[PDB]
């Protein structure tokens, strides 16, 4: 057809624009924020992929949960996740954010940030190396590339 070709091209353009410009929230909790900083360091240079930290949640595309989520912090994490304008994505970093990790049986730790917010990518490690988080970010970019919003809208 002709309309489906147009919506496919528009999907390609929108997904390309969205994945090339991924702005994570300046958000970090524990040990894994250090490796995220090292990803921002000159050796890996997360800026060169179009990925720059921005403090305000209203100006953020991705949330990287890097560290332990505690019961005291869970409302704050949910609050800053809800204030992100959509489309928004969540990357889980390290054992503590993935499933509770080394404090899984604690009384004050949330066993996985996916009990609080929906997670798109699970990066494993304690902590994941800077290339591990870079691999996760590029995997999220490929996942964004694979989405088809206007093709599904056109077929409704």
């Amino acid at each position: 057809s002709r309309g489906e070709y147009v919506v496919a091209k528009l999907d390609d353009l929108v997904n390309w624009a969205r994945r090339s410009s991924l702005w994570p929230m300046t958000f970090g909790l524990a040990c894994c924020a250090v490796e995220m900083m090292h990803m921002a360091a000159p050796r890996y240079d997360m800026d060169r992929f179009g990925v720059v930290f921005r403090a305000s949640p209203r100006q953020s595309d991705v949330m990287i949960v890097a560290g332990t989520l505690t019961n005291k912090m869970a409302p704050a994490l949910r609050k800053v996740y809800d204030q992100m304008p959509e489309p928004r994505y969540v990357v889980s970093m390290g054992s503590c954010a993935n499933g509770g990790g080394y404090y899984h049986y604690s009384y004050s730790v949330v066993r996985g940030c996916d009990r609080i917010v929906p997670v798109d990518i699970y990066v494993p490690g304690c902590p994941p190396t800077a290339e591990a988080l870079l691999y996760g970010i590029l995997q999220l970019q490929r996942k964004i590339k694979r989405e088809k919003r206007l093709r599904i809208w056109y077929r409704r």
Binding site: P87, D114, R115, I116, V117, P118, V119, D120, E147, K148, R149, I152, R155, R156
Partner: protein, 342 residues
């Protein structure tokens, strides 16, 4: 009972409830509440979806690890329906549109799809089927929505004789098109009401009550081939209801009467939207139609649900429609509306 399905635990997130449910239309207003209630108990929920997987993210925190499974299906393909209902012992049908899209008309989403779902569930060994129809569904109504609802209800009953049929009435909640719909027309200066809303009676029902009733019908042995009417505790005139809606939102209420032909015309004009229409002619017909009273049918009180009145839950929906001046106003400040109770 197939040992792998014997209930275990305290009915929490990590428990086993023995329920394996395929929830059709789980990405809608009612579907999220139904999936939340099922995953609270520790049930295996199968979530069939046709939309973008991004639009299913909100359903993932609703179950434990492995308890919510997302599969792609096509409404017009029966192999997909077999794939998603093959291993389930309960099937819930919440599929439905409020407008007719170019690819699916009313009898495609209310007649063909429910019938195919029911037949494949019956021939796949599914034990329980829950079908959601409308309270005002009859074959002689001016609304194509309700005519298709009645035809599909009878055809589903034909294809699955022991199916439970539930007929709610004007579900109101946070992501609803009822309370929200009325609040949304404040911008158009006035509120157009056919005959000023003095000849229409509504009995809206809370969303949580409908979800609880569906869950109770799932686990009620006596509700196999029955039909339920899910209605609220109070009946309101449409004028009084909209007046209360605007009073809770703290907006100025300026209603005016509009003839049926002109307001149908503006509905038809709005229908041309390639996206979700603001209103349609069928929406007009349903809005200005009185609610049927079916006292012979079982209701929420027969499933143990005490219907929640609108006055205790309208603020949680209509506070979003307030301005900064009235944002902190409390619940018991807005003088509950006049009720047409018998």
């Amino acid at each position: 009972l197939h040992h792998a399905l014997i209930p275990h635990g305290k009915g929490g997130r990590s428990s086993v409830s023995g329920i394996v449910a395929t929830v059709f239309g789980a990405t809608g207003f009612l579907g999220r509440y139904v999936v939340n209630h099922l995953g609270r108990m520790g049930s295996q929920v199968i979530v069939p979806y046709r939309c973008e997987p991004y639009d299913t993210m909100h359903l993932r925190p609703m179950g434990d690890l492995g308890q919510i499974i997302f599969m792609e299906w096509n409404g017009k393909d029966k192999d997909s329906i077999r794939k998603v209902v093959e291993h389930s012992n309960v099937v819930i049908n919440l599929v439905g549109r409020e407008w007719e899209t170019k690819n699916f008309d009313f009898e495609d989403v209310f007649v063909k799809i429910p019938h195919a779902i029911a037949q494949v569930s019956k021939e796949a060994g599914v034990e329980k089927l829950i079908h959601i129809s409308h309270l005002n569904a009859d074959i002689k109504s001016p609304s194509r929505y309700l005519r298709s609802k009645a035809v599909g209800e009878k055809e589903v009953r034909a294809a699955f004789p022991e199916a439970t049929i539930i007929k709610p009435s004007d579900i109101f909640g946070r992501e609803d098109r009822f309370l929200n719909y009325f609040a949304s027309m404040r911008w158009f200066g006035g509120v157009p009401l056919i005959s000023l809303g003095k000849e229409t009676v509504k009995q809206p029902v809370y969303i949580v009550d409908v979800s609880k009733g569906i869950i109770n019908a799932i686990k009620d042995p006596d509700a196999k081939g029955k039909t339920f009417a899910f209605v609220g505790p109070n009946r309101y005139l449409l004028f009084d209801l909209v007046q209360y809606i605007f009073a809770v939102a703290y907006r100025p209420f300026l209603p005016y009467p509009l003839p049926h032909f002109a307001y149908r015309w503006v509905g038809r004009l709005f229908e041309v939207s390639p996206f979700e229409p603001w209103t349609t002619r069928d929406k007009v017909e349903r809005v200005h139609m009185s609610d049927m009273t079916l006292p012979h049918l079982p209701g929420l009180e027969d499933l143990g649900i005490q219907a929640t009145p609108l006055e205790l839950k309208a603020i949680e929906v209509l506070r979003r429609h307030r301005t900064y001046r009235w944002l902190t106003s409390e619940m018991e400040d807005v003088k509950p509306a006049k009720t047409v109770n018998i």
